[PDB]
Design a protein around this ligand. Structure first.
Ligand SMILES: CCCCCCOc1cccc(Cn2ccc(O)c(C(=O)O)c2=O)c1
Ligand SMILES: [Mg+2]
Ligand SMILES: [Mg+2]
Ligand SMILES: [Mg+2]
Length: 281
C-alpha cells in the first residue's frame, strides 16, 4: 500500500472505532467513494472530539482553510497529517462544502459553554450544526449531480441520525452533564432528567421520548421517500445506514428506555436489515 493508502486506512480506523453502524454500511461503497467518506467522517470526528482546550481545534480549522485556499499546494498540516492529507486528496477530486466544516467547528466551539436548549428550535439548530453539516459535506460524494434537494435530503438525514443518537444516549449524556431535550419540551412533559436517572422511567418520560422518536421516524420516512437524489450505488447503502440507525429506537424500547446502558444493534441484525433492503433493490 502507498503512503496515501495508509492515510485513508487511518481515517477508516477512526470511523469504525466511533461507529460500527456507519462503517458497516459505508464500507460497502465502491473504493473511491468509500475512502472519501472515511476521510470526511474522520475529520468530523477529530473536530467533534478535539476539546476533550481549543488549540487542536484551531489547528484543524487552519488546516481546512489551507486546503480550501490552496488545494494543490503541499501543506505542513498543524493538526493530524494523515487525516488532512486524505481530506486534501478528496478535495482535489470533489467539491467539498467547506462552509459546512466551519459550521460544525463553530458549533463545537459553542458546546464548550454548553447551556441547555430553550426550545426545540435551538435543539434542531444544534442537530444541523453537528450532523446536518456532515450530511452537507458528504453530499458530493454520494450523488452525481447535486442540487438544493440533494443537500436538503442529506441534511435532514444527518439531523435525524443525530436525534436518534440523542435518544439512545440520554443516560450517558446526563452523566457527562449534558441534556439535549429542550426546556420547553421537558417542562411541558413534566420531566426532570436527573430525577428519571435516579428513579427510573415513568410515563411522562416515555411520552417525551416518544415525542422526539416520532419526529425522528417521520424525518426518516421523508428521507427514504427521496432516496433517489443519491447515486444508484449509494442508495441502498444510505438506506441501510438509516435503517440500522433507526433500529436503535426499538432497542431503546426493548431495553425499556434505560438510562444506564448504551443499547445497540447486533452485527447479525445489521446483516439481516441489509438483506431485507436488497429484496427490493
Ligand atoms: C447523505 C449522507 C448521509 C448523512 C450521514 C450523517 O452521518 C452523521 C453525521 C453526524 C452525526 C451523525 C449521528 N451520530 C452517529 C453516531 C455518533 O456516535 C454520533 C455522536 O457521537 O454524536 C452521532 O452524532 C451521523
Ligand atoms: Mg454512533
Ligand atoms: Mg455528531
Ligand atoms: Mg450521543
Amino acid at each position: 500500500m502507498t503512503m496515501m493508502d495508509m492515510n485513508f486506512k487511518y481515517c477508516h480506523k477512526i470511523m469504525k472505532k466511533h461507529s460500527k453502524s456507519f462503517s458497516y454500511a459505508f464500507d460497502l461503497l465502491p473504493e473511491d467513494q468509500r475512502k472519501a467518506v472515511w476521510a470526511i467522517y474522520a475529520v468530523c470526528r477529530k473536530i467533534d472530539d478535539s476539546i476533550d482546550d481549543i488549540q487542536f481545534l484551531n489547528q484543524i480549522k487552519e488546516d481546512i482553510q489551507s486546503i480550501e485556499k490552496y488545494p494543490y499546494e503541499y501543506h505542513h498540516f498543524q493538526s493530524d497529517r494523515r487525516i488532512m492529507m486524505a481530506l486534501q486528496h478528496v478535495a482535489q477530486h470533489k467539491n467539498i462544502a467547506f462552509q459546512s466544516f466551519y459550521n460544525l467547528i463553530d458549533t463545537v466551539y459553542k458546546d464548550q459553554h454548553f447551556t441547555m436548549f430553550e426550545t426545540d428550535a435551538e435543539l434542531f439548530g444544534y442537530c444541523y450544526g453537528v450532523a446536518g453539516t456532515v450530511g452537507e459535506v458528504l453530499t458530493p460524494i454520494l450523488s452525481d449531480h447535486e442540487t438544493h434537494q440533494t443537500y436538503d435530503v442529506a441534511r435532514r438525514l444527518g439531523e435525524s441520525l443525530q436525534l436518534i443518537n440523542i435518544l439512545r444516549d440520554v443516560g450517558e449524556d446526563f452523566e457527562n452533564e449534558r441534556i439535549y431535550f429542550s426546556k420547553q419540551r421537558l417542562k411541558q412533559y413534566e420531566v426532570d432528567i436527573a430525577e428519571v436517572y435516579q428513579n427510573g422511567v415513568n410515563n411522562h418520560y416515555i411520552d417525551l421520548w416518544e415525542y422526539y422518536a416520532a419526529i425522528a421516524e417521520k424525518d426518516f420516512r421523508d428521507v427514504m421517500d427521496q432516496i433517489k437524489v443519491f447515486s444508484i450505488e449509494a442508495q441502498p447503502i444510505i438506506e441501510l445506514a438509516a435503517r440500522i440507525y433507526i433500529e436503535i429506537l426499538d432497542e431503546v424500547r426493548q431495553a425499556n428506555y434505560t438510562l444506564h446502558e448504551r443499547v445497540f444493534v447486533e452485527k447479525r441484525k445489521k446483516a439481516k436489515l441489509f438483506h431485507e433492503i436488497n429484496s427490493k433493490y
